């Protein structure tokens, strides 16, 4: 019947998307991860010619480069660092930068994140139903000044999500010297919540102890993007969930 | 207004759960962390004064175990690759083993991410419902080969979903030397949709290329543990939502 037909369609459209975005990923990384490997393992060659390493104590070495890359950034367990893991796993962010350790440290990660995860998203489309209702507002009392339809309703939310994109980008690149396609796609990365960690903010030079006031801006920008972005999205789908 | 009330409230909540959090993160991990970092550090400088290596060619050496580190596992490029890193993309998992090297494959990237969430959000919930009806139609059989409240449904959704997890973690740890809590561990990071990336599967001995077995069951577990946690989140989040 119907929901049957739906559900059947919607996973062989699915299916296609994932061949082709991973055929077209395929044929846009392959050469590049080639000539990528190819120059690291030369590299690699020639400093192990020239400085004689033994083998067994370059896997030791590997290993203990692999495990003090977190802590060359800083002291990332600290309230400040604590107030960060704590955001990106109630976000469901996962940057990964720093990870438990322990098992009880494991096992209250996971409550935590069972206990938190719904009352953030219950918060975060209360916050953007309200953010909705302002731009309503806003947008009928402009109008007055100068009935409203959704079509200017979706245009007014992409132009804000293309700024609050911009402003976040420069915001961003002129305070952790990036450069501004690269701010531009960590920031997008970071309100999609999905968070491949391989640009994560706060992590020069000791930022998250000397300077207060970035942190602060940056769980603003984080927390102002991620409502702005909560009432896009269920404008846009929630009419088609029920 | 109600509304105000109800948006103020979830807020104040919402950030003393994050204080709690906080605190008690950095109260079990400080400790560990410093004692890590002694004794990561003692080590280093026992090795460099051993091997005399020259503090400009460390800092080479770093940047190319950071660079090669995805390397080590075979080609994460290829077609199991490509794929493997599409569905995180769309899932919002974000492992990071993988990141895009090309401004126009991050443009891409972005655009796949952007046209596909939305449809792979409606297709789990579809999903989600289907099961979720199928599940009630079963206990009903059930009841009348031996009405169905909200508290038995919660019930069974608890139980399947703990049965999930069980066997995911089980066949995890009897595949890649893995412990059960570490595998239980992983499993609920990736269910979560958080990704730390800390444990990656299919990154040992080239799985991803001479065992497509494994591959096809490890997605195959991933869609279903998606699917189970979306009815669940369905049954209690969306009752409270709208
Ligand atoms: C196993 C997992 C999925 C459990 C998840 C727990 C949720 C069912 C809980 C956790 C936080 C709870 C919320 C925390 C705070 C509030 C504000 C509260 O608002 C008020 O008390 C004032 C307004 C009013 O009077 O309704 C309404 C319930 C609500 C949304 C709660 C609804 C139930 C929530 C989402
Ligand atoms: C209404 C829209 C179009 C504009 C919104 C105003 C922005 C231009 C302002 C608002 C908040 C500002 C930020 C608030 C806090 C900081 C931290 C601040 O950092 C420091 O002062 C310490 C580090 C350093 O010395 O750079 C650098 C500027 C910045 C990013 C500000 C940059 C300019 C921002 C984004
Ligand atoms: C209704 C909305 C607008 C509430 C917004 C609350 C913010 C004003 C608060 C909430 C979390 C706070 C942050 C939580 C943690 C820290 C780390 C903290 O760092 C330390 O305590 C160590 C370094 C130092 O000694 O300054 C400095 C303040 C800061 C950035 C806080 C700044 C003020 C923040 C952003
Ligand atoms: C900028 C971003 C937010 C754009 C997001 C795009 C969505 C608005 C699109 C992308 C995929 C679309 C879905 C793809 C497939 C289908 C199946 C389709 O079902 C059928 O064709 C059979 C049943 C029927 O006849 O209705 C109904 C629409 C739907 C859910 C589509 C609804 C609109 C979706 C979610
Ligand atoms: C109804 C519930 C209670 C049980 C569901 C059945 C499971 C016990 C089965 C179903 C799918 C099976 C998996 C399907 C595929 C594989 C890949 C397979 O790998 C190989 O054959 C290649 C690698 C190797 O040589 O080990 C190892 C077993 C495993 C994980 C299987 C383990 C047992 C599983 C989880
Ligand atoms: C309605 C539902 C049940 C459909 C389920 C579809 C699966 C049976 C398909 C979809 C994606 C497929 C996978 C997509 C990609 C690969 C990589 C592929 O690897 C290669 O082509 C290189 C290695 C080799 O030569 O085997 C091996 C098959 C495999 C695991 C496929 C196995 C079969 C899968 C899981
Ligand atoms: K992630
Ligand atoms: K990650
Ligand atoms: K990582
Ligand atoms: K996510
Ligand atoms: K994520």
Redesign the interface.
Known sequence: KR??V??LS??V??FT???V??????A???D??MR??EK??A??IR?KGK?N?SSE?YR???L??????P?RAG?????A???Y???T??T???Y?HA????????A???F??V?????????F???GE?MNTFVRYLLKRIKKCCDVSMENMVTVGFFSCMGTLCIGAAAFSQCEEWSF?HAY?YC??TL???????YVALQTKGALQKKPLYVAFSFMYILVGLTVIGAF?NL??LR???
């Open positions: 929901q049957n739906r559900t919607l996973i459209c699915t998307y994932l061949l975005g991973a055929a077209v990923f395929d846009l990384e392959s590049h991860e990528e490997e690291l393992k590299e690699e400093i400085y390493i104590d030791q070495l590997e203990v480069i692999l495990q003090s890359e802590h002291v990332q367990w600290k309230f660092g604590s107030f893991f704590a955001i796993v109630i469901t962010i996962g990964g990870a438990p350790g322990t098992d009880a440290g494991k209250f990660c996971m935590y994140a206990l938190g995860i719904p009352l953030t998203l219950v918060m489309q209360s916050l309200r396609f796609y997008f990365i999609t919540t999905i968070g491949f960690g391989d999205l846009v789908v088609f969930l029920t």
